[PDB]
Amino acid sequence: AESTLGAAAAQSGRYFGTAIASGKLGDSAYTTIASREFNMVTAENEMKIDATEPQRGQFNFSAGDRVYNWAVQNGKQVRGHTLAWHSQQPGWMQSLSGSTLRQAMIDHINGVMGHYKGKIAQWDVVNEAFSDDGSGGRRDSNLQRTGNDWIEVAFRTARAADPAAKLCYNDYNIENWTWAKTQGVYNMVRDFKQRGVPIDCVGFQSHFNSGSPYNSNFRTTLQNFAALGVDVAITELDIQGASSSTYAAVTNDCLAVSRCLGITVWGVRDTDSWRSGDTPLLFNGDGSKKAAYTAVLNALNGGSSTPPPSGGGQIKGVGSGRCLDVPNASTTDGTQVQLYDCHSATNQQWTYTDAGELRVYGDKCLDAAGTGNGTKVQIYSCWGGDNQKWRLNSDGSIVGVQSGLCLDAVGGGTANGTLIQLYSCSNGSNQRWTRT
């Protein structure tokens, strides 16, 4: 069922999940997308420490169970997040230190895992235990001050609480191999394995942005941890800008590492993101698929069996043999595009950007002046509107992000001068394109 992220991921034995927020489950648009696209669920906040143990010794699973029930009800496995962490600790825990904190950490793990015993596929036992100062050492928190062995203790406690769950160490900024933090985490997991400390996986949050950009060496990082005898998972994926290339690259990295169990993006729609300003997810506020959604789906499905048009190129219609053409090489905003004999001309060289735009002349964009059938497809100053974003379907169709409509050669026309419009996708030859 290569039409959804989860089903496509399953074609390689992997899963594709998202972070679910219980307060959004009543939003039909939200749940429709969530239930359809993912087969793995992580509670975005409902299973955290402050949410599960409001007061010392007083557990509360109402919020967590809403997420859990929704997941199982809709056929999804669940990643528990998270048992031990320095952040978002309830007030009573923040006031703790030393052995009292250590026992509280232990009691919390037992309580929460006990409640979900045998129902959780993966547990992020310890979250973000390493520093960002740049040296790759432990993060100084009340937990770390109880003793360096707190992490090991948390894992030994978790294994005993629920031996059916895969135990993961989860963290961010550990994707680039050259980072000290990545290496500090590697050394710890290696040590655990060497000493029989029970740890089954390492979760790479994968929160990519210009401050901590994705880097191709991520594949070696995954390979390096996998070699230690642990599974690896991309746990909180989101990319600032939602670059199609970066999203596909990360997906391909996981598909290249047999031990990479799957990918979870941190949210459903950009508006649901903890960093919405970065529009880093696969669906926009409207609930529509972004250019990145298609890049990911295509990567999961193996991608095109030929070299993608790097540095721009022509877009030739299959049912007409003619290329996408801007009339008379005009640069006037509002000029509807047409079909025309292909040739070496700037007014026929289109470049698909990572943001999903189809640019010509360098700063002009394939633009749709509306969202319904017949809408004129023209060129307009590039600005990033969804009516300027396109998805390149593997079936050769090019769909408008905002409209969900396909580029369509009017009346099935095939001769030069044939104009281009938007139209309900029909899988027709006049809606199919082969690039060059």
Ligand X SMILES: OC[C@H]1O[C@@H](O)[C@H](O)[C@@H](O)[C@@H]1O
Instruction: Give the active site residues.
Output: 236
How many residues bind ligand X (CB under 6 A)? The answer is 15
Residues 391-410 touching ligand X, rule: CB under 6 A, are 408, 410
Selected binder of ligand X within 384, 411, 427, 436 (CB under 6 A): 411
Q: Is 408 annotated as a binding residue?
A: yes
114 binds, among ligand X, a copy of itself, none (CB under 5 to 8 A by kind): none
325 binds, among a copy of itself, ligand X, none (CB under 5 to 8 A by kind): ligand X
Q: Is 147 in the site for ligand X (CB under 6 A)?
A: no
Per-residue binder mask for ligand X (CB under 6 A), 274-313, x = binder: ----------------------------------------
Q: Is 238 in the site for a copy of itself (CB under 8 A)?
A: no
Q: Is 13 annotated as a binding residue?
A: no
Per-residue binder mask for a copy of itself (CB under 8 A), 333-352, x = binder: xx----------------x-
Residues 163-222 touching a copy of itself, rule: CB under 8 A, are 210-211, 213-216
Number of residues in the chain: 436
Q: Is 328 annotated as a binding residue?
A: yes
Q: Is 430 in the site for ligand X (CB under 6 A)?
A: yes
Q: Is 360 in the site for a copy of itself (CB under 8 A)?
A: no
Q: Is 296 in the site for a copy of itself (CB under 8 A)?
A: no
Is the Cβ of residue 288 or residue 431 nearer to ligand X in the bound state? 431
Residues 147-166 touching a copy of itself, rule: CB under 8 A, are none
Q: Is 287 in the site for a copy of itself (CB under 8 A)?
A: no
Residues 260-279 touching a copy of itself, rule: CB under 8 A, are 278-279
356 and 391 Cβ atoms separated by less than 8 Å: yes
Q: Is 347 in the site for ligand X (CB under 6 A)?
A: yes
246 binds, among ligand X, a copy of itself, none (CB under 5 to 8 A by kind): a copy of itself
Contact set with a copy of itself (CB under 8 A):
210-211, 213-216, 240-243, 245-246, 278-279, 311-312, 332-334, 351, 353-355, 362-363, 367-370, 378, 380-385, 387
